[PDB]
């Protein structure tokens, strides 16, 4: 039974063989059959022989068009991040800043010590994040887990209508330095996401189980009463940071994991996640779907204040995969209830 698998909803890690690795959608279905989605976040370590790019010594002149200076404001584990756009710069220029004494990773022993330093110094010395860069570092002939062309049913958006949504069905690169953050969020349309750390220092993550996401939302509306009034889904603005000590103090179930260079992280529908970079690094990310995502897409609560513009029409999905509920859904009478513990149907294998 689904409730019986990964009942603690803890972050799982997988080490596929190259044979299991070759079929992306299939391996996602496998890890769900093991309960991985209940944590909201999973690690996949690819076969040691697999490489998405030959070397990264040839990207120093790649342009980061809109680097972001991250000014964080707050106290007692609760923060709001404000973005200041900086002028474009090259990877070379960015690495130099990231590694300069002003911005570099501080000295530490255990990850636990670095984590404490992050939460203590988050609002000081605002760092610059090279975020939302359109592009890919995958070499063109890599066919396994190519973030540029995963061949999931999310492809139906572009295939049927021609619509591309940057970072959603196209890839984004993220150039990190110490103390750059990604605030608490689920993906647009509560999609899955895939995140690969090409090189550099680690990226640390926090995740809340999808079956407990409503609890986190309840806590956040309470602590940011202003934001909650102005938008039905203000966490999608990706400005809200909440420390793990605050999650513990209010009983929000969560887990933490550190991603190292060469590892993938998968986020699952309605899995809230946040985190930070340890130092200079580069990650590549995009969204994807499975059949189980469709019901989350139908039910996603979207930003109401126009700050987050991403909306995908679900009609194509409901028509193709849920023909028996289409008419009901169009009349607003599809009362379907999501069971977050269930794996996607492709996993029945």
Q: What is the spatial distance between Cα 282 and Cα 238, in angstroms, rounded to a whole number? A: 19
State yes or no: 37 annotated in a binding site: no
Q: Which of 307, 316, 320, 334 binds Zn ion (CB under 5 A)?
A: 307
Q: Pick from Ni ion, Zn ion, none: which does 231 bind, CB < 5 to 8 A by kind?
A: Zn ion
Q: Which of 85, 305, 313, 319 binds Zn ion (CB under 5 A)?
A: 305
Give the per-residue contact string, 174-193, with Ni ion (x = CB under 5 A; - = no).
-------------------x
Tokens of 133: 């860069």
Number of residues that bind Zn ion (CB under 5 A): 4
Residue 1 annotated in active site: no
- In this complex, which beta carbon is closest to Ni ion, that of residue 207 or of residue 322? 207
Which residues 187-246 are close enough to bind Ni ion by CB under 5 A? 193
CA 61 to centroid of chain Cα atoms:
27
- In this complex, which beta carbon is closest to Ni ion, that of residue 40 or of residue 67? 40
Catalytic residue among 187, 217, 263, 284: 187
Q: What is the spatial distance between Cα 106 and Cα 110, in angstroms, rounded to a whole number? A: 12
Q: Which of 29, 194, 242, 303 binds Zn ion (CB under 5 A)?
A: 303
SS (H, E, C) the chain: CHHHCCCCCCCEEECCCHHHHCCHHHHHHHHHHCCHHHHCEEEECCCCCCCCCCCCCCCCCCEECCCEEEEEEEECCEEEEEEEECCCEEHHHHHHHHHCCCCCCCCCCCHHHHHHHHHHHCCCCCCEEEEEEECCCCCCCCCCCCCCCCCCCCHHHHHHHCCCCCCCCCCEEEEECCCCEEEEECCHHHCEEEEEEEEECCEEEEEECHHHHHHHHHHHHHHCHHHHHHCCCHHHHCCEEECHHHHHHCCCCCEEEEECCCCEEEECCCCEEEEEECCCEEEEEEEECCCCHHHHHHHCCCCCCCCCCCCCCCHHHHHHHCCCCHHHHHCCCCCCCCCCCCCCHHHHC
- In this complex, which beta carbon is closest to Ni ion, that of residue 145 or of residue 268? 268
State yes or no: 231 annotated in a binding site: yes
Q: Pick from Ni ion, Zn ion, none: which does 305 bind, CB < 5 to 8 A by kind?
A: Zn ion
- In this complex, which beta carbon is closest to Zn ion, that of residue 307 or of residue 325? 307
Catalytic residue among 138, 174, 196, 296: 174
State yes or no: 311 annotated in a binding site: no
Nearest of 126, 138, 306 to residue 233 by alpha carbon: 306
Beta carbons of 195 and 267 less than 8 angstroms apart: yes
Residue 185 annotated in active site: yes
State yes or no: 305 annotated in a binding site: yes
Which residues 87-146 are close enough to bind Zn ion by CB under 5 A? none
Residue 187 annotated in active site: yes
Least Å distance between CB 247 and Zn ion? 23
Least Å distance between CB 18 and Ni ion? 27
Catalytic residue among 185, 198, 278, 340: 185
Residue 228 makes contact with Zn ion by CB under 5 A: no
Residue 37 annotated in active site: no
Q: Pick from Zn ion, Ni ion, none: which does 163 bind, CB < 5 to 8 A by kind?
A: none
Binding residues for 2-oxoglutarate, by number, are: 129, 195, 203, 238
Residue ranges binding Ni ion (CB under 5 A)? 193
Positions annotated as catalytic residues are 167, 174, 185, 187, 273, 285
Binding residues, by number, are: 129, 185, 187, 195, 203, 231, 237-238, 273, 303, 305
Residue ranges binding Zn ion (CB under 5 A)? 231, 303, 305, 307
């Amino acid at each position: 039974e689904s409730e019986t698998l990964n009942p603690s909803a803890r972050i799982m890690t997988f080490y596929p063989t190259m044979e299991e690795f070759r079929n992306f959608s299939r391996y996602i279905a496998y890890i769900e059959s093991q309960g991985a989605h209940r944590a909201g976040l999973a690690k996949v370590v690819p076969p040691k022989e697999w490489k998405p790019r030959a070397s990264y010594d040839d990207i120093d002149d790649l342009v980061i068009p809109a680097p972001i200076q991250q000014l964080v404001t707050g106290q007692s584990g609760l923060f709001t991040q404000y973005n200041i756009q900086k002028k474009a710069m090259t990877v070379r220029e960015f690495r130099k800043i990231a590694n300069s004494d002003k911005y570099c990773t501080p000295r530490y022993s255990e990850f636990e010590e670095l984590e404490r330093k992050y939460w203590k110094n988050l609002t000081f010395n605002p760092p610059i994040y090279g975020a939302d860069v359109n592009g890919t570092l995958y070499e063109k002939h890599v066919d396994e887990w190519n973030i540029g062309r995963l061949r999931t049913i999310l492809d139906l958006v572009e295939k049927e209508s021609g619509i591309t949504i940057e970072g959603v069905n196209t890839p984004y690169l993220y150039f990190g330095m110490w103390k750059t953050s990604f605030a608490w969020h689920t993906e647009d349309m509560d999609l899955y996401s895939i995140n690969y750390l090409h090189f550099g220092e680690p990226k640390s993550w926090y995740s809340v189980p999808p079956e407990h996401g409503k609890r986190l939302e309840r806590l956040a509306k309470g602590f940011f009463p202003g934001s909650a009034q102005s938008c039905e889904a203000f966490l999608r603005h990706k400005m809200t940071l909440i420390s793990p000590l605050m999650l513990k103090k209010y009983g929000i179930p969560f887990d933490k994991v550190t991603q190292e260079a060469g590892e993938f992280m998968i986020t699952f529908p309605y899995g809230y996640h946040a985190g930070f970079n340890h130092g200079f690094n580069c990650a590549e990310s995009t969204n994807f779907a499975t059949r189980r995502w469709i019901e989350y897409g139908k039910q996603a609560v979207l930003c109401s204040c126009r700050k987050d513009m991403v909306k995908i029409s679900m009609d194509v999905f409901v028509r193709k995969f849920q023909p028996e509920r289409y008419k009901l859904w169009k009349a607003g009478k599809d009362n379907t209830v999501i069971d977050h513990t269930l794996p996607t149907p492709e996993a029945a294998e």
